[PDB]
Design a protein around this motif. Structure first.
Motif, PDB file in Angstrom:
ATOM      1  N   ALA A   1      55.730  54.124  37.123  1.00 43.63           N
ATOM      2  CA  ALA A   1      54.967  52.903  36.890  1.00 43.63           C
ATOM      3  C   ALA A   1      55.688  51.675  37.469  1.00 43.63           C
ATOM      4  CB  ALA A   1      54.693  52.731  35.399  1.00 43.63           C
ATOM      5  N   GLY A   2      56.014  51.752  38.761  1.00 40.90           N
ATOM      6  CA  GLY A   2      56.531  50.613  39.529  1.00 40.90           C
ATOM      7  C   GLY A   2      55.444  49.839  40.258  1.00 40.90           C
ATOM      8  N   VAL A   3      54.557  50.567  40.941  1.00 37.64           N
ATOM      9  CA  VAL A   3      53.514  49.968  41.787  1.00 37.64           C
ATOM     10  C   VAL A   3      52.417  49.281  40.960  1.00 37.64           C
ATOM     11  CG1 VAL A   3      51.957  51.987  42.021  1.00 37.64           C
ATOM     12  CG2 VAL A   3      52.164  50.337  43.908  1.00 37.64           C
ATOM     13  N   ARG A   4      51.840  48.218  41.521  1.00 33.82           N
ATOM     14  CA  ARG A   4      50.719  47.499  40.904  1.00 33.82           C
ATOM     15  C   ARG A   4      49.390  48.193  41.219  1.00 33.82           C
ATOM     16  NH1 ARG A   4      53.290  43.673  43.517  1.00 33.82           N
ATOM     17  NH2 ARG A   4      51.457  43.073  44.769  1.00 33.82           N
ATOM     18  N   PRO A   5      48.397  48.083  40.308  1.00 35.30           N
ATOM     19  CA  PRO A   5      47.293  49.048  40.283  1.00 35.30           C
ATOM     20  C   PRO A   5      46.269  48.837  41.411  1.00 35.30           C
ATOM     21  CG  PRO A   5      46.897  47.362  38.648  1.00 35.30           C
ATOM     22  CD  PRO A   5      48.209  47.017  39.303  1.00 35.30           C
ATOM     23  N   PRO A   6      45.266  49.734  41.516  1.00 33.68           N
ATOM     24  CA  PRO A   6      44.179  49.528  42.483  1.00 33.68           C
ATOM     25  C   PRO A   6      43.293  48.314  42.182  1.00 33.68           C
ATOM     26  CG  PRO A   6      44.274  51.824  41.770  1.00 33.68           C
ATOM     27  CD  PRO A   6      45.150  51.041  40.843  1.00 33.68           C
ATOM     28  N   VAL A   7      42.593  47.842  43.215  1.00 33.70           N
ATOM     29  CA  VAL A   7      41.746  46.647  43.114  1.00 33.70           C
ATOM     30  C   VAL A   7      40.473  46.945  42.311  1.00 33.70           C
ATOM     31  CG1 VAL A   7      42.662  45.763  45.308  1.00 33.70           C
ATOM     32  CG2 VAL A   7      40.440  46.945  45.303  1.00 33.70           C
ATOM     33  N   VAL A   8      40.150  46.065  41.362  1.00 30.56           N
ATOM     34  CA  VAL A   8      38.902  46.137  40.597  1.00 30.56           C
ATOM     35  C   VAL A   8      37.931  45.089  41.135  1.00 30.56           C
ATOM     36  CG1 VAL A   8      37.838  45.974  38.300  1.00 30.56           C
ATOM     37  CG2 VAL A   8      40.135  46.978  38.571  1.00 30.56           C
ATOM     38  N   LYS A   9      37.043  45.518  42.032  1.00 28.94           N
ATOM     39  CA  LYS A   9      36.117  44.608  42.705  1.00 28.94           C
ATOM     40  C   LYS A   9      35.022  44.133  41.751  1.00 28.94           C
ATOM     41  CE  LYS A   9      36.792  46.316  47.410  1.00 28.94           C
ATOM     42  NZ  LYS A   9      36.116  46.685  48.683  1.00 28.94           N
ATOM     43  N   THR A  10      34.594  42.882  41.917  1.00 29.95           N
ATOM     44  CA  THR A  10      33.519  42.305  41.103  1.00 29.95           C
ATOM     45  C   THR A  10      32.875  41.093  41.794  1.00 29.95           C
ATOM     46  OG1 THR A  10      32.907  41.562  38.857  1.00 29.95           O
ATOM     47  CG2 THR A  10      35.018  40.762  39.725  1.00 29.95           C
ATOM     48  N   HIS A  11      31.555  40.980  41.668  1.00 30.27           N
ATOM     49  CA  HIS A  11      30.812  39.850  42.235  1.00 30.27           C
ATOM     50  C   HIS A  11      30.976  38.619  41.359  1.00 30.27           C
ATOM     51  CE1 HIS A  11      29.075  41.258  45.855  1.00 30.27           C
ATOM     52  NE2 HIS A  11      27.898  40.669  45.749  1.00 30.27           N
ATOM     53  N   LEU A  12      30.832  38.799  40.046  1.00 28.17           N
ATOM     54  CA  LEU A  12      30.650  37.681  39.114  1.00 28.17           C
ATOM     55  C   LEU A  12      31.904  36.809  39.016  1.00 28.17           C
ATOM     56  CD1 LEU A  12      31.903  38.156  35.827  1.00 28.17           C
ATOM     57  CD2 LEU A  12      30.518  40.204  36.232  1.00 28.17           C
ATOM     58  N   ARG A  13      31.728  35.518  39.291  1.00 28.94           N
ATOM     59  CA  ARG A  13      32.834  34.597  39.563  1.00 28.94           C
ATOM     60  C   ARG A  13      33.184  33.737  38.344  1.00 28.94           C
ATOM     61  NH1 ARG A  13      32.613  30.851  43.619  1.00 28.94           N
ATOM     62  NH2 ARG A  13      34.244  31.776  44.945  1.00 28.94           N
ATOM     63  N   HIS A  14      32.359  33.798  37.298  1.00 28.86           N
ATOM     64  CA  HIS A  14      32.352  32.788  36.235  1.00 28.86           C
ATOM     65  C   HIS A  14      32.848  33.374  34.907  1.00 28.86           C
ATOM     66  CE1 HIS A  14      28.671  34.389  34.328  1.00 28.86           C
ATOM     67  NE2 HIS A  14      28.260  34.628  35.561  1.00 28.86           N
ATOM     68  N   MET A  15      33.778  34.327  34.991  1.00 30.05           N
ATOM     69  CA  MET A  15      34.414  34.921  33.811  1.00 30.05           C
ATOM     70  C   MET A  15      35.685  34.134  33.501  1.00 30.05           C
ATOM     71  SD  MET A  15      35.137  37.040  31.361  1.00 30.05           S
ATOM     72  CE  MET A  15      34.813  38.578  30.496  1.00 30.05           C
ATOM     73  N   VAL A  16      35.940  33.893  32.217  1.00 28.94           N
ATOM     74  CA  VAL A  16      37.255  33.421  31.770  1.00 28.94           C
ATOM     75  C   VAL A  16      38.328  34.488  32.025  1.00 28.94           C
ATOM     76  CG1 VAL A  16      37.119  34.199  29.338  1.00 28.94           C
ATOM     77  CG2 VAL A  16      38.501  32.193  29.941  1.00 28.94           C
ATOM     78  N   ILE A  17      39.527  34.048  32.402  1.00 37.35           N
ATOM     79  CA  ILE A  17      40.700  34.922  32.462  1.00 37.35           C
ATOM     80  C   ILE A  17      41.346  34.934  31.077  1.00 37.35           C
ATOM     81  CG2 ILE A  17      42.926  35.395  33.577  1.00 37.35           C
ATOM     82  CD1 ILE A  17      40.447  35.476  35.486  1.00 37.35           C
ATOM     83  N   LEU A  18      41.532  36.130  30.536  1.00 38.33           N
ATOM     84  CA  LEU A  18      42.128  36.318  29.227  1.00 38.33           C
ATOM     85  C   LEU A  18      43.448  37.069  29.328  1.00 38.33           C
ATOM     86  CD1 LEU A  18      40.266  38.727  29.888  1.00 38.33           C
ATOM     87  CD2 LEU A  18      38.942  38.110  27.857  1.00 38.33           C
ATOM     88  N   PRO A  19      44.292  36.924  28.238  1.00 34.88           N
ATOM     89  CA  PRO A  19      45.581  37.625  28.364  1.00 34.88           C
ATOM     90  C   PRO A  19      45.432  39.131  28.495  1.00 34.88           C
ATOM     91  CG  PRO A  19      45.733  36.004  26.613  1.00 34.88           C
ATOM     92  CD  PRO A  19      44.284  36.216  26.880  1.00 34.88           C
ATOM     93  N   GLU A  20      44.299  39.653  28.051  1.00 32.61           N
ATOM     94  CA  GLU A  20      44.042  41.084  28.086  1.00 32.61           C
ATOM     95  C   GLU A  20      44.111  41.668  29.499  1.00 32.61           C
ATOM     96  OE1 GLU A  20      41.074  42.030  25.376  1.00 32.61           O
ATOM     97  OE2 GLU A  20      41.193  44.208  25.636  1.00 32.61           O
TER      98      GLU A  20
END
Lengths: 146, 52, 118, 133, 73, 97, 135, 186
Positions: free
Chosen positions: C55-74
């Motif tokens: 678990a060194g490498v950072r994960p695969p890309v999670v693609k999404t269209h919707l631009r208006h989501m809050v960023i949460l600590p989760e």
RNA sequence: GCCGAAGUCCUUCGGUUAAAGUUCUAAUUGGGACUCCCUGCGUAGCAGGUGGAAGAGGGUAGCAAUAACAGGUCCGUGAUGCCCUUUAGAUGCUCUGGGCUGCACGCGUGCUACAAUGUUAGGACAAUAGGAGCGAGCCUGAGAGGGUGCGCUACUCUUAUAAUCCCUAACGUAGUUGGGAUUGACGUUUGUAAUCAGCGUCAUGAACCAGGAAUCCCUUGUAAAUGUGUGUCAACAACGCA
């Protein structure tokens, strides 16, 4: 020549408006009618206004003015009073519009007056009571002698 | 069919078109006419409007 | 050294979404009250799954269209393909990008560079 | 004995109402000392200074702004005095002459009213501003 | 230019203003700030100090401008 | 007996003045006792050119609304007969008070 | 001239011959509204000149603006309030603001927020058009 | 119609128009009809050419002192200023204001002017007392703009020196330029 | 005129299917002004004057001949000829997202200012519109806002005690309580969405000291100032029409 009445002594209509309203402002500060609220004192009279009032005893001179203006229009609403005491909005680059006063400052008074019974509520706006319009013609003969 | 984007309070709702025109370029909503202006002015005298 | 509202990283992760939104900006807790459901729920499902597999490498890309989501600590430290109307631009999330609009980090237009005369 | 006549400037309209009484003249519900200006005090009393100890006048108004509401009252006072002497004639013609010597507006009024706004411009006769070239 | 007057009334200049101000028939705050080199905010408050004591009646009590005279008994 | 109001409305004044004459005329025959409201100008101010070309000129389209109110005491028998004018672009609302 | 102008306090040097609540406006972070709220709550006279203010009185006014929540203030009328980092409402003053606002611009550039770009490029941020205006 | 006095203070019994001079006085408009309690009036004075004569002269000043672009309209403002001149005029000197006023309206407006070489025409008495009131009031606001001094005073400073024929005045300085230009061009 | 409340011997308010009306209010039919009258000038008419609500087309609009501009609009149309597109991996239609709002710079219409004939604080009259959406009164909160939803299918109920002006104070010629751009954060409404929307709050406190050569509009309720409605509109006017 000058306007002349009947009826000998003076009434709330007769004596001049700039004079009368300040004599009625003094008549609350001696009697402990109305009081100041304690929450307030730093609040702008209206959101449109750019600064606090100068006078520090300003609360009473407002509370005199509303009782004077219940007298002259018989009925007086809250939302009707709020519209009155507003003004133009001065700062912004656009042209200037009429915005309203605060409600809470005016509501606080019209509840405080109904403690000492000077204004009943009724149909339409509030209308001043037998005790109330007596208190004005006390002060009319105070400043009528003067 | 039945376009799924809501269009409750929107310029391209089907009420908002010129009724005669079927197009919305320059609409008169007042007095619930819902008629485009070029469409209006052809047939304004029939409706009972007049120049004075 | 990082806090959001005088609260560190893991105790924001512990306290869940419901108490977290008591201390977003009041632009942003409107978006949680009105119009959160279904489209949004899928995201934090999918940003759980890419996060788990690492678990060194950072994960695969999670693609999404919707631009208006809050960023949460989760979803901190995920990669997100955010649509510019053109390309899924990819941003690994930092702690300082909490409590913001997801559109901000996909700029839709080029800087400019002006030349020459005309 | 009583007469009920009006004045009118611009879009003010002030009615007055004579009776018999003891020299009381009353705007709205109050003596016409109290208009709070010092110019417009002296403007309403121009009718009375020229020329009412019998009469009792009672004036009510609507319309206009602050100035034109006064100029209706100068009409309504003066006309109601003249209309009292006409009903209740020798002396009416000569006291009316003292007003028409002073100024014509105390009886006649003026018919000018604002010109409608025209398109292509911010007001009636002004137009916006050209460019050229 | 930067023609700065001054915000302080001194104990010397107070002795001058007792003499020469009531000699003037009509004088405002405006004309003190010419002569004695002071702010009009002080020159207003100087005149309202003099009228409370003795000498110096306001000829005009009108808002905006004020203009003081002598005291005819 | 339920003192009834007519309320007579029109676009055009000649077409109105026929109906007022008849409905005042018929209260002469029936003998029912008989007791102008302010008119509206519905001004709609369209730009008269189709395109953006040319000097900005504006036609003004006033629709006019003339409105009269007769009313009278009447016993339901007599009123059925009076109501039944039939003119182009006239309306008559009956209103019980 | 018994009194002093040019009075040094709170790392600025506020004016004298200038009536108090306007004098405190020369500090960054106290403005015209909040200055009246300090003096009213100081509490003395707004009109009195900052010429006078004898140091025992002056020591009060500095304790108010540092500790506003504590000194009978509503808190709606505060410079920061609910800061994300501290999650506490207290309001900034003096030489701090010019250095501590800079961090809130600097952090945007590190994030590559849309705002953080337009500070760096020196353009308008808030959604004004820049076709014609601003040159 | 027995007292008949301006602002309820001053009187027109004085002012000796015959005494003031020959000519000029006629377009002055201080002859009985002109007198009024307050200079405010419902004007109908711009209808036909010479009707400006029949209005009062003190009103005609209050209209000139209505500029520029902010003070337009607001006559009811201007007749305070001209009142608070006419206190400062009267209570300083002890002359009453209307005498020393009309002497100012005499000596400001220059005889002659360059009609566009340029040729030096003469003037009407109408155009003299017009360009009296302009070159008084022009000087007042030009002085009073930025000056830490009330314009009622700055009217009264201009208006005294106009009577006594001093080159303090913005009026009576500016005529001697304009009159000398007419003498030069000729 | 009655019945109220104060004044407390006659003054002012509020109410009233209660008797008489029409000066204000509302709107239909008619009257009214014609260079008729007088005096000058040159029959057509002109200039002044009396009277008159109004005097010279009473003011302001609306309508407006023939003859043309390769001026505009195929992005208004079930107005349309021809050309090509329908190879559906469509130039048909529709969903998610982004644009038309991108900025070294040049021009047009506008807005707000440069203050003291002012700003700040406190106190004291409009008209035209629109509305089964307007939204009464009373509570809640500094504020914006929020809750409860009385009347009105409207000269009835409602948006709705407009703003310059006026009257008491404060300021003091300074880039200053002039000016309010640009930025940081918090508190909210509208919406499927605020990432480039508006409102509030506290901070930030810029350029501008009247603008070169040039140019625009305007003759009476006109210019200029000063607000208010309406069109677009879920929300947003510095714009248009009144």
């Amino acid at each position: 020549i000058g306007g002349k009445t009947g009826h000998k002594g003076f009434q709330a209509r007769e004596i001049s408006a700039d004079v009368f309203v300040n004599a009625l402002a003094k008549h609350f500060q001696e009697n402990r009618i109305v009081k100041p609220p304690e929450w307030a004192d730093l609040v702008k009279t209206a959101a449109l206004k750019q600064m606090a009032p100068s006078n520090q005893n300003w609360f009473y001179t407002r509370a005199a003015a509303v009782i004077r203006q219940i007298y002259m229009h018989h009925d007086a609403s809250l939302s009707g009073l709020s519209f009155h005491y507003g003004a133009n909005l001065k700062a912004v680059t656009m042209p200037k519009h009429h915005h309203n006063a605060s409600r809470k400052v005016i509501r606080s008074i019209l509840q405080q007056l109904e403690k000492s019974d000077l204004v009943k509520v009724g149909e339409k706006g509030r209308q001043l009571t037998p005790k109330g319009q007596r208190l004005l013609d006390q002060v009319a003969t105070s400043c009528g002698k003067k | 069919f039945v376009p799924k984007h809501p269009r409750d309070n929107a310029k391209g709702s089907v009420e908002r078109s010129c009724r005669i025109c079927g197009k919305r370029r320059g609409v008169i909503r007042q007095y619930r006419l819902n008629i485009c202006r070029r469409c209006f002015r052809e047939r304004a005298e029939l409706l009972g409007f007049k120049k004075y | 050294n990082y806090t959001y509202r005088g609260k560190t990283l893991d105790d924001l992760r512990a306290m869940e979404l419901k108490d977290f939104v008591e201390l977003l900006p009041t632009k942003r807790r409107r978006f949680i009250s009105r119009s959160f459901d279904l489209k949004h729920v899928h995201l934090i499902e999918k940003l759980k799954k890419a996060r788990q597999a690492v678990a060194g490498v950072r994960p695969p890309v999670v693609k999404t269209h919707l631009r208006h989501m809050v960023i949460l600590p989760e979803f901190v430290d995920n990669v997100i393909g955010i649509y510019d109307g053109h390309v899924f631009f990819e941003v690994q999330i930092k702690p300082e990008m909490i409590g913001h609009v997801l559109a901000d980090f996909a700029p839709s237009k080029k800087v400019v560079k002006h030349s020459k005369a005309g | 004995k009583s007469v009920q006549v009006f004045g009118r400037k611009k879009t003010a309209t002030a009615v007055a109402y004579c009776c018999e009484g003891s020299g009381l003249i009353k705007l709205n519900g109050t003596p016409i000392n109290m208009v709070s200006s010092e110019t417009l005090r002296a403007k309403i009393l121009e009718p009375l200074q020229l020329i009412w100890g019998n009469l009792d006048i009672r004036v009510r108004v609507h319309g206009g702004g602050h100035v034109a509401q006064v100029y209706a009252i100068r009409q309504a006072v003066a006309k109601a005095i003249v209309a009292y002497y006409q009903k209740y004639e020798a002396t009416k013609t000569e006291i009316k002459n003292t007003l028409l010597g002073y100024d014509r507006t105390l009886l006649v009024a003026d018919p000018r009213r604002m010109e409608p706004k025209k398109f292509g411009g911010q007001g009636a006769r002004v137009r916006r501003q050209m460019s050229y070239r | 230019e930067k023609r700065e007057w001054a915000v302080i009334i001194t104990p010397e200049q107070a002795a001058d203003m007792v003499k020469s101000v009531p000699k003037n028939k009509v004088i405002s705050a405006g004309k003190l700030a010419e002569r004695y080199k002071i702010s009009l905010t002080c020159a207003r408050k100087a005149l309202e100090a003099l009228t409370a004591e003795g000498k110096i009646v306001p000829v005009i009590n009108g808002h905006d401008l004020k203009c003081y005279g002598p005291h005819p008994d | 007996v339920q003192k009834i109001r007519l309320t007579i409305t029109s676009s055009k004044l000649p077409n109105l003045q026929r109906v007022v004459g008849n409905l005042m005329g018929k209260l002469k025959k029936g003998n029912l006792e008989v007791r102008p409201m302010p008119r509206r100008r519905l001004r709609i101010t369209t730009r008269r050119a189709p395109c953006g070309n040319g000097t900005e000129t504006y036609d003004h389209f006033e629709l006019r609304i003339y409105k009269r109110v007769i009313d009278f005491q009447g016993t339901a028998e007599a009123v059925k007969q009076v109501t039944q004018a039939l003119e182009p672009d006239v309306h008559v609302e009956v209103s019980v008070i | 001239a018994a009194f002093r102008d040019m009075v040094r306090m709170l790392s600025t040097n506020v004016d004298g011959r200038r009536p108090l609540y306007l004098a405190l406006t020369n500090i960054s972070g106290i403005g015209r509204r909040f200055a009246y709220a300090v003096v009213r709550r100081a509490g003395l006279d707004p009109l009195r000149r900052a010429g006078t203010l004898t140091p025992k009185e002056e020591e009060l006014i500095v304790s108010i603006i540092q500790n506003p929540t504590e000194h009978q203030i509503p808190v709606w009328m505060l410079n920061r309030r609910f800061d994300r980092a501290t999650g506490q409402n207290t309001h900034w003053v003096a030489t701090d603001l010019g250095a501590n606002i800079r961090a809130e611009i600097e952090r945007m550039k590190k994030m590559r927020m849309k705002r953080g770009i337009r500070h760096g490029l020196g353009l308008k941020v808030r959604g004004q058009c820049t076709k014609s205006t601003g040159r | 119609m027995e007292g008949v006095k301006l602002f309820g203070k001053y009187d027109y019994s004085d002012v000796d128009f015959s005494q003031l001079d020959p000519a000029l006085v006629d377009y002055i408009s201080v002859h009985e009809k002109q007198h009024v309690m307050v200079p405010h009036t419902a004007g109908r004075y711009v209808h036909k050419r010479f009707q400006k004569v029949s209005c009062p002269l003190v009103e005609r000043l209050c209209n000139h002192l209505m500029s520029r672009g902010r003070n337009t309209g607001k006559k009811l403002l201007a007749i305070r200023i001209v009142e608070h001149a006419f206190d400062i005029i009267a209570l300083s000197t002890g002359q009453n204001p209307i005498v020393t006023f009309v002497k100012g309206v005499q000596y400001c407006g220059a005889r002659e002017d360059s009609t566009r070489r340029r040729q030096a025409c003469d003037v009407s008495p109408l155009r003299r007392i017009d360009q009296a009131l302009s070159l008084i009031t022009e000087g007042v606001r030009k002085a009073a703009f930025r000056s830490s001094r009330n314009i009622a005073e700055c009217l009264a400073d201009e208006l005294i020196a106009a009577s006594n024929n001093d080159q303090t005045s913005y009026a009576c300085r500016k005529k001697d330029e304009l009159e000398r230009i007419a003498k030069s061009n000729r």
